Short mmCIF file of N, CA and C in Angstrom, two decimals:
data_model
loop_
_atom_site.label_atom_id
_atom_site.label_comp_id
_atom_site.label_asym_id
_atom_site.label_seq_id
_atom_site.Cartn_x
_atom_site.Cartn_y
_atom_site.Cartn_z
N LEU A 2 65.51 138.50 47.05
CA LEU A 2 63.93 138.24 48.12
C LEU A 2 64.61 138.14 49.77
N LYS A 3 64.79 137.46 49.84
CA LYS A 3 65.75 136.80 51.56
C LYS A 3 66.10 138.32 52.32
N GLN A 4 65.57 138.51 53.01
CA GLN A 4 65.39 140.14 53.61
C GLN A 4 66.26 139.88 54.83
N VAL A 5 67.49 141.01 55.51
CA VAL A 5 68.81 141.18 56.55
C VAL A 5 68.65 142.24 56.88
N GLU A 6 68.99 142.22 58.12
CA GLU A 6 69.17 143.32 58.35
C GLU A 6 70.67 143.19 59.40
N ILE A 7 71.76 144.18 59.30
CA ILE A 7 73.07 143.95 59.37
C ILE A 7 73.66 145.54 60.16
N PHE A 8 73.75 144.49 61.84
CA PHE A 8 74.43 146.16 62.55
C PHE A 8 76.38 145.65 62.26
N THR A 9 77.33 146.95 62.30
CA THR A 9 78.54 146.81 62.58
C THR A 9 78.74 147.76 63.49
N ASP A 10 80.21 147.78 63.85
CA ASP A 10 80.87 148.61 64.71
C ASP A 10 82.31 148.47 64.44
N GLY A 11 83.49 149.06 64.81
CA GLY A 11 85.08 148.54 64.81
C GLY A 11 85.22 149.71 66.21
N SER A 12 86.69 148.83 66.67
CA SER A 12 86.41 149.67 67.90
C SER A 12 88.42 148.74 67.74
N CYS A 13 88.56 150.86 68.42
CA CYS A 13 90.68 150.49 68.55
C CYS A 13 91.03 150.92 69.69
N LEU A 14 91.90 150.60 70.58
CA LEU A 14 92.60 151.51 71.61
C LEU A 14 93.88 152.16 71.66
N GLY A 15 93.89 151.70 70.25
CA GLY A 15 95.23 153.21 70.03
C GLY A 15 95.27 153.73 68.39
N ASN A 16 95.87 153.81 67.79
CA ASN A 16 95.86 154.23 66.02
C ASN A 16 96.96 153.99 65.59
N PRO A 17 97.66 153.02 65.43
CA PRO A 17 96.82 151.61 65.80
C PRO A 17 96.98 151.05 67.30
N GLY A 18 96.60 150.32 67.23
CA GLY A 18 96.75 149.42 68.34
C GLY A 18 95.60 148.09 68.79
N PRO A 19 95.41 147.42 69.92
CA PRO A 19 94.69 146.07 69.96
C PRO A 19 93.44 147.14 69.67
N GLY A 20 92.51 146.06 68.74
CA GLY A 20 90.90 146.95 67.99
C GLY A 20 90.23 145.03 67.82
N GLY A 21 89.06 145.22 67.81
CA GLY A 21 87.79 144.09 67.81
C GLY A 21 86.94 144.72 67.07
N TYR A 22 86.15 143.69 66.16
CA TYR A 22 85.17 144.28 65.84
C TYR A 22 83.85 143.76 66.15
N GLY A 23 82.78 144.37 65.73
CA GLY A 23 81.14 143.57 66.45
C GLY A 23 80.27 143.47 65.49
N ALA A 24 79.75 142.64 65.22
CA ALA A 24 78.83 142.50 63.94
C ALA A 24 77.52 141.76 64.53
N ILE A 25 76.37 142.06 63.97
CA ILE A 25 75.31 141.18 63.99
C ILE A 25 74.59 141.41 63.08
N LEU A 26 73.34 140.38 63.05
CA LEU A 26 73.10 139.87 61.74
C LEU A 26 71.68 139.26 61.71
N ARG A 27 70.72 139.55 61.62
CA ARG A 27 69.73 139.75 62.36
C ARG A 27 68.67 139.36 60.57
N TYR A 28 67.62 138.05 61.18
CA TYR A 28 67.19 137.37 60.31
C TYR A 28 65.30 136.97 60.87
N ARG A 29 64.56 137.22 60.49
CA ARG A 29 62.98 137.18 61.11
C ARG A 29 62.96 137.42 62.72
N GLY A 30 63.45 138.30 62.92
CA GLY A 30 63.35 138.05 64.49
C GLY A 30 65.16 137.42 65.06
N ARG A 31 65.65 136.08 64.27
CA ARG A 31 66.73 135.45 64.71
C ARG A 31 67.79 136.34 64.37
N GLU A 32 68.98 136.11 65.60
CA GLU A 32 70.09 136.97 65.49
C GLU A 32 71.52 135.79 65.66
N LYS A 33 72.50 137.14 65.02
CA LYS A 33 73.63 136.32 65.03
C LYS A 33 75.25 137.00 65.00
N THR A 34 75.70 136.63 65.73
CA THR A 34 76.64 137.57 66.79
C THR A 34 77.91 137.40 65.97
N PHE A 35 78.92 138.44 66.02
CA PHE A 35 79.89 138.10 65.56
C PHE A 35 81.40 139.36 65.94
N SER A 36 82.14 138.91 66.47
CA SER A 36 83.43 139.82 66.71
C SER A 36 84.75 138.53 67.00
N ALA A 37 85.70 139.40 67.09
CA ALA A 37 87.19 139.08 67.16
C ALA A 37 87.85 140.08 67.36
N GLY A 38 89.11 139.94 68.01
CA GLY A 38 90.41 141.07 68.25
C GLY A 38 91.58 140.43 68.03
N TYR A 39 91.92 141.80 67.45
CA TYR A 39 93.13 141.47 66.90
C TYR A 39 94.52 142.43 67.79
N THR A 40 95.22 141.60 67.60
CA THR A 40 96.62 142.67 68.43
C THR A 40 97.29 143.94 68.29
N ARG A 41 97.12 144.33 66.72
CA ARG A 41 97.29 145.27 66.26
C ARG A 41 96.88 145.72 65.35
N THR A 42 96.21 146.65 65.25
CA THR A 42 95.35 146.92 63.54
C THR A 42 94.58 148.80 64.07
N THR A 43 93.25 148.89 63.18
CA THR A 43 93.35 150.14 63.18
C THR A 43 91.28 149.72 63.67
N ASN A 44 91.14 151.30 62.91
CA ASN A 44 89.57 151.33 63.81
C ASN A 44 88.75 150.89 62.26
N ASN A 45 89.70 151.82 61.66
CA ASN A 45 89.20 151.68 60.54
C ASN A 45 89.00 149.66 59.55
N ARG A 46 89.88 149.06 59.76
CA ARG A 46 90.51 148.05 59.05
C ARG A 46 89.40 147.47 59.75
N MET A 47 88.82 147.31 61.13
CA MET A 47 87.71 146.58 62.18
C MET A 47 86.57 146.58 61.73
N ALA A 48 86.56 148.28 61.16
CA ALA A 48 84.77 148.64 60.80
C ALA A 48 85.12 148.15 59.42
N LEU A 49 85.64 147.77 58.23
CA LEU A 49 85.52 146.99 57.53
C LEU A 49 85.47 145.65 57.85
N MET A 50 86.14 145.17 58.49
CA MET A 50 86.08 143.65 58.93
C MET A 50 84.57 143.55 59.68
N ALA A 51 84.03 144.37 60.47
CA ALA A 51 82.38 143.87 60.58
C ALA A 51 81.44 143.36 59.98
N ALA A 52 81.88 144.37 58.48
CA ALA A 52 80.59 144.44 57.67
C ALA A 52 80.88 142.99 57.00
N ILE A 53 82.17 143.01 56.22
CA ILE A 53 83.00 142.10 55.78
C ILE A 53 82.13 140.55 56.41
N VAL A 54 82.87 140.63 57.47
CA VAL A 54 82.08 139.26 58.18
C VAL A 54 80.48 138.57 57.95
N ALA A 55 79.97 139.70 58.73
CA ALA A 55 78.35 139.41 58.43
C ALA A 55 78.52 139.39 57.03
N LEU A 56 78.56 139.84 55.93
CA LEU A 56 78.32 140.17 54.34
C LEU A 56 78.02 137.82 53.96
N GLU A 57 79.24 137.99 54.35
CA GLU A 57 80.16 136.65 53.90
C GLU A 57 79.77 135.43 54.51
N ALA A 58 78.68 135.77 55.87
CA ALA A 58 77.76 134.86 56.13
C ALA A 58 76.78 134.36 56.05
N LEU A 59 76.33 135.36 54.60
CA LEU A 59 74.98 135.03 53.63
C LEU A 59 75.12 133.78 53.04
N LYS A 60 74.38 133.27 53.08
CA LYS A 60 74.61 131.26 51.78
C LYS A 60 73.32 131.68 50.72
N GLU A 61 73.04 133.26 50.28
CA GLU A 61 72.21 133.20 49.36
C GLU A 61 71.90 134.75 48.97
N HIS A 62 71.26 135.22 47.69
CA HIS A 62 71.33 136.51 47.56
C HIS A 62 70.42 137.09 48.58
N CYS A 63 70.55 138.20 49.26
CA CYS A 63 70.00 138.89 50.09
C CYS A 63 69.55 140.77 49.76
N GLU A 64 68.50 140.93 50.33
CA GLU A 64 68.45 142.12 50.73
C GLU A 64 68.58 142.84 52.02
N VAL A 65 69.86 143.58 52.48
CA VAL A 65 70.80 143.66 53.41
C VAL A 65 70.46 145.48 53.30
N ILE A 66 69.73 145.74 54.52
CA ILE A 66 70.09 147.18 55.34
C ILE A 66 71.18 147.34 55.98
N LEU A 67 72.23 147.67 55.95
CA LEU A 67 73.36 147.32 57.10
C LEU A 67 74.16 149.11 57.53
N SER A 68 74.10 148.96 58.53
CA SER A 68 73.98 149.92 59.46
C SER A 68 75.33 150.50 60.14
N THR A 69 76.51 151.10 59.98
CA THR A 69 77.43 151.36 60.37
C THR A 69 77.62 153.06 60.38
N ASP A 70 78.92 153.39 61.00
CA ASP A 70 79.07 154.98 61.40
C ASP A 70 80.19 154.97 61.27
N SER A 71 80.65 154.51 60.58
CA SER A 71 82.26 154.62 59.46
C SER A 71 82.17 155.25 58.92
N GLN A 72 83.32 156.49 58.85
CA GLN A 72 82.93 157.11 57.86
C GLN A 72 84.13 156.87 56.89
N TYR A 73 85.23 155.86 57.22
CA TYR A 73 85.51 155.22 56.37
C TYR A 73 85.20 154.55 55.84
N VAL A 74 84.66 153.78 56.14
CA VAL A 74 83.69 152.77 55.15
C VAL A 74 82.72 153.86 54.38
N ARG A 75 82.45 154.61 54.58
CA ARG A 75 81.20 155.00 53.92
C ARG A 75 81.69 155.76 52.36
N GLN A 76 83.11 156.76 52.88
CA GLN A 76 83.40 157.20 51.67
C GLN A 76 84.03 156.34 50.35
N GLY A 77 84.84 154.85 51.04
CA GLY A 77 84.71 154.05 50.27
C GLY A 77 84.20 153.34 49.29
N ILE A 78 82.87 152.72 50.09
CA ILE A 78 81.82 152.78 49.24
C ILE A 78 80.81 153.42 48.18
N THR A 79 80.76 154.57 48.70
CA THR A 79 80.38 155.93 48.03
C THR A 79 81.16 157.03 47.03
N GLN A 80 82.09 156.47 47.28
CA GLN A 80 82.81 157.46 46.26
C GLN A 80 84.57 157.07 45.73
N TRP A 81 85.56 156.19 46.91
CA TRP A 81 86.71 155.37 46.23
C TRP A 81 86.72 154.22 45.26
N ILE A 82 85.66 153.13 46.14
CA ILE A 82 85.51 152.23 45.81
C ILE A 82 85.76 151.87 44.12
N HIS A 83 85.25 152.62 43.45
CA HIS A 83 84.36 152.77 42.28
C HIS A 83 85.63 152.98 41.16
N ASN A 84 86.58 154.05 41.60
CA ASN A 84 87.35 154.52 40.82
C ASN A 84 88.28 153.61 40.57
N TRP A 85 88.74 152.99 42.33
CA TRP A 85 89.56 151.65 42.51
C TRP A 85 89.48 150.54 41.23
N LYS A 86 88.52 150.02 41.65
CA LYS A 86 88.00 149.06 40.35
C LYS A 86 88.44 148.83 39.24
N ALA A 87 88.20 150.04 38.39
CA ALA A 87 88.17 150.24 37.66
C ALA A 87 89.58 150.73 36.81
N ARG A 88 90.39 150.79 37.71
CA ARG A 88 91.88 150.87 37.68
C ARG A 88 93.04 150.08 38.32
N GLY A 89 92.41 148.61 38.05
CA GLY A 89 93.58 147.75 38.69
C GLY A 89 93.52 148.37 40.28
N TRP A 90 92.48 149.36 41.09
CA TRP A 90 92.86 149.68 42.39
C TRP A 90 94.29 150.12 42.49
N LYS A 91 94.06 151.53 41.91
CA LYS A 91 94.93 152.36 41.84
C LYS A 91 95.17 153.59 42.58
N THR A 92 96.28 154.55 43.29
CA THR A 92 95.38 155.68 43.62
C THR A 92 95.74 156.74 42.87
N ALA A 93 95.88 157.84 43.42
CA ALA A 93 95.87 159.00 42.60
C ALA A 93 97.77 159.02 41.50
N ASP A 94 97.88 157.81 41.74
CA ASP A 94 99.96 158.17 41.35
C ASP A 94 99.41 156.32 40.99
N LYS A 95 99.36 155.53 40.63
CA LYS A 95 99.44 154.81 40.06
C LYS A 95 99.66 153.31 41.12
N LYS A 96 99.60 153.81 42.74
CA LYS A 96 100.13 153.45 43.34
C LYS A 96 98.98 152.75 44.02
N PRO A 97 99.61 151.26 44.70
CA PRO A 97 98.47 150.73 45.40
C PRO A 97 97.70 151.55 46.52
N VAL A 98 96.33 150.61 46.78
CA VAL A 98 95.44 151.43 47.49
C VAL A 98 95.33 150.57 49.26
N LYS A 99 95.10 151.26 50.08
CA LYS A 99 95.53 150.69 51.91
C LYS A 99 94.58 150.18 51.58
N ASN A 100 94.71 149.26 52.53
CA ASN A 100 93.34 147.91 53.12
C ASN A 100 93.42 147.46 51.78
N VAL A 101 93.70 147.25 50.49
CA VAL A 101 93.11 146.69 49.20
C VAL A 101 92.78 145.40 49.90
N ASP A 102 93.33 144.16 50.84
CA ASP A 102 92.69 143.36 50.66
C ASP A 102 91.26 143.03 51.51
N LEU A 103 90.82 143.87 52.44
CA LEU A 103 89.82 144.33 52.87
C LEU A 103 88.75 145.08 51.68
N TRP A 104 88.93 146.54 51.15
CA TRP A 104 88.70 146.64 49.99
C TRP A 104 88.02 145.69 49.00
N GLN A 105 88.86 144.92 48.77
CA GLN A 105 88.07 144.19 47.65
C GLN A 105 87.93 143.14 48.23
N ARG A 106 87.77 142.35 49.26
CA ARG A 106 86.98 141.89 49.70
C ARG A 106 85.79 141.91 50.06
N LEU A 107 85.43 143.11 50.86
CA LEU A 107 84.07 143.62 51.33
C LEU A 107 83.40 144.24 49.77
N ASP A 108 84.17 144.81 48.28
CA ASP A 108 83.87 145.25 47.50
C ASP A 108 83.26 143.47 46.84
N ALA A 109 83.40 142.75 47.23
CA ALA A 109 83.05 141.30 46.61
C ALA A 109 81.77 140.56 47.22
N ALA A 110 81.85 141.25 48.40
CA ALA A 110 80.84 140.85 49.26
C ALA A 110 79.59 140.96 48.76
N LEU A 111 79.62 142.68 48.32
CA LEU A 111 78.80 143.52 48.43
C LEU A 111 78.26 143.01 46.86
N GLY A 112 78.64 142.55 45.87
CA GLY A 112 78.23 142.29 44.33
C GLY A 112 77.87 141.02 45.08
N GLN A 113 77.30 140.39 45.58
CA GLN A 113 76.56 139.15 46.01
C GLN A 113 75.30 139.57 46.34
N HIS A 114 74.69 141.04 46.97
CA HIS A 114 74.04 140.96 47.92
C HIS A 114 73.10 142.34 47.16
N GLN A 115 71.97 143.26 47.39
CA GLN A 115 71.67 144.46 47.29
C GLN A 115 71.61 145.27 48.35
N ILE A 116 72.73 145.46 48.85
CA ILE A 116 72.55 146.27 49.79
C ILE A 116 72.71 147.64 50.03
N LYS A 117 71.66 148.02 50.86
CA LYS A 117 71.09 149.35 50.88
C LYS A 117 71.83 149.86 53.03
N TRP A 118 72.64 150.80 52.45
CA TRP A 118 73.52 151.15 53.80
C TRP A 118 73.09 152.63 54.42
N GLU A 119 73.12 152.49 55.55
CA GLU A 119 72.61 153.24 56.48
C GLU A 119 74.07 153.53 57.52
N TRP A 120 73.89 154.74 56.98
CA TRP A 120 75.23 155.92 57.51
C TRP A 120 75.04 156.34 58.68
N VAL A 121 74.81 155.68 60.05
CA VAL A 121 74.38 156.49 61.51
C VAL A 121 75.60 157.45 61.81
N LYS A 122 74.74 157.72 63.95
CA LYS A 122 76.05 158.08 64.40
C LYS A 122 75.07 158.22 65.88
N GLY A 123 75.75 156.99 66.67
CA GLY A 123 75.11 156.94 67.58
C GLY A 123 75.31 158.19 68.68
N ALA A 125 72.13 157.74 63.24
CA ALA A 125 70.79 157.13 63.86
C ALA A 125 71.64 156.08 64.89
N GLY A 126 72.21 156.82 66.43
CA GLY A 126 72.26 155.36 67.50
C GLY A 126 71.39 154.57 67.43
N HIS A 127 71.45 153.78 66.90
CA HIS A 127 70.50 152.72 67.09
C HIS A 127 71.38 151.38 68.12
N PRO A 128 70.37 150.97 69.29
CA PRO A 128 70.40 149.86 70.04
C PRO A 128 71.61 149.21 69.42
N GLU A 129 71.49 148.52 68.70
CA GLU A 129 72.53 147.04 68.14
C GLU A 129 73.51 147.97 68.00
N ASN A 130 73.92 149.08 66.94
CA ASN A 130 75.84 149.70 66.93
C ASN A 130 75.81 149.40 67.93
N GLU A 131 75.68 149.80 68.97
CA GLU A 131 75.74 150.25 70.45
C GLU A 131 76.46 148.97 70.90
N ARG A 132 75.34 147.95 70.33
CA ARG A 132 75.40 146.66 70.94
C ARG A 132 76.83 145.70 70.54
N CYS A 133 77.20 146.25 68.69
CA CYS A 133 78.50 145.87 68.56
C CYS A 133 79.52 146.92 68.57
N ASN A 134 79.04 147.70 68.91
CA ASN A 134 80.05 148.69 69.67
C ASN A 134 80.80 147.55 71.35
N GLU A 135 80.36 147.68 72.00
CA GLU A 135 80.31 146.56 72.61
C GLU A 135 81.06 145.34 71.86
N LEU A 136 80.62 144.56 71.60
CA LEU A 136 81.16 143.21 71.22
C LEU A 136 82.36 143.77 70.68
N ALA A 137 83.12 145.37 70.10
CA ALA A 137 84.26 145.12 69.78
C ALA A 137 85.02 145.57 70.59
N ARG A 138 84.85 146.29 71.43
CA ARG A 138 85.33 146.77 72.38
C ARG A 138 85.77 145.48 73.27
N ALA A 139 85.06 144.61 73.68
CA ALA A 139 85.05 143.44 74.34
C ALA A 139 86.71 143.05 74.13
N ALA A 140 86.08 142.42 72.54
CA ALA A 140 87.43 142.33 71.73
C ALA A 140 88.41 142.74 71.57
N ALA A 141 88.89 143.86 71.83
CA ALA A 141 89.77 144.61 71.52
C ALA A 141 90.81 144.64 72.96
N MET A 142 89.69 144.47 73.94
CA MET A 142 90.39 143.85 75.22
C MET A 142 90.47 142.46 75.48
N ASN A 143 90.92 141.84 74.19
CA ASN A 143 91.16 140.52 74.83
C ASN A 143 91.59 139.85 73.44
N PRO A 144 92.68 140.34 72.93
CA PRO A 144 92.71 140.25 71.26
C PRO A 144 92.98 138.70 71.34
N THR A 145 92.98 138.00 70.45
CA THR A 145 93.58 136.47 70.28
C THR A 145 93.98 136.34 68.66
N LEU A 146 94.11 137.33 67.42
CA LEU A 146 94.36 137.21 66.72
C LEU A 146 95.57 137.83 65.91
N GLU A 147 96.49 138.19 64.61
CA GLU A 147 97.05 138.74 64.64
C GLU A 147 96.47 139.67 63.28
N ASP A 148 96.50 141.08 63.32
CA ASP A 148 95.87 141.50 61.53
C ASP A 148 96.66 141.39 60.71
N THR A 149 97.28 140.46 60.06
CA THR A 149 98.57 140.48 59.08
C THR A 149 98.04 141.66 57.95
N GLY A 150 96.64 141.32 57.63
CA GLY A 150 96.73 142.56 56.28
C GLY A 150 96.76 143.88 57.00
N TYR A 151 97.38 143.88 57.67
CA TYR A 151 97.64 145.66 58.76
C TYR A 151 99.29 146.24 58.03
N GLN A 152 99.14 147.12 57.48
CA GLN A 152 100.59 147.47 57.24
C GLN A 152 100.88 148.32 58.04
N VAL A 153 101.69 148.15 59.04
CA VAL A 153 101.84 149.57 59.82
C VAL A 153 102.25 150.29 60.06
N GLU A 154 101.97 151.71 60.04
CA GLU A 154 101.75 152.97 60.12
C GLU A 154 100.89 153.51 58.88
#
């Protein structure tokens, strides 16, 4: 029943390089912000983190409208994540899946709520733009290591 709105964005100075994520959780006008910067990561991983952090902050089952502009997240959600799960998370050749640590973590957070995904594109909402600013700000002041990132 509880309805919330989530906005997310990932940002990276390189590929790989210093990056950050920015997310906003809005409930009844009220707002909650999330951001963190990593010394060496990818925009894809940051895009996943933004959604993961905002979703895991929820303390009850909620109806969520999650807005993101990541094409990487879109494909996983609407296409890959399904096949992966039903195959112990394997690729075309029974191999491990890239960023499984985040995809599994995100997959879990999704099963916790009824998510309605809005795949935008700066639908450039002011919120997504603000998340980008939070992400970029974090990328410019990294404080953590992205241990889950497999170089290259």
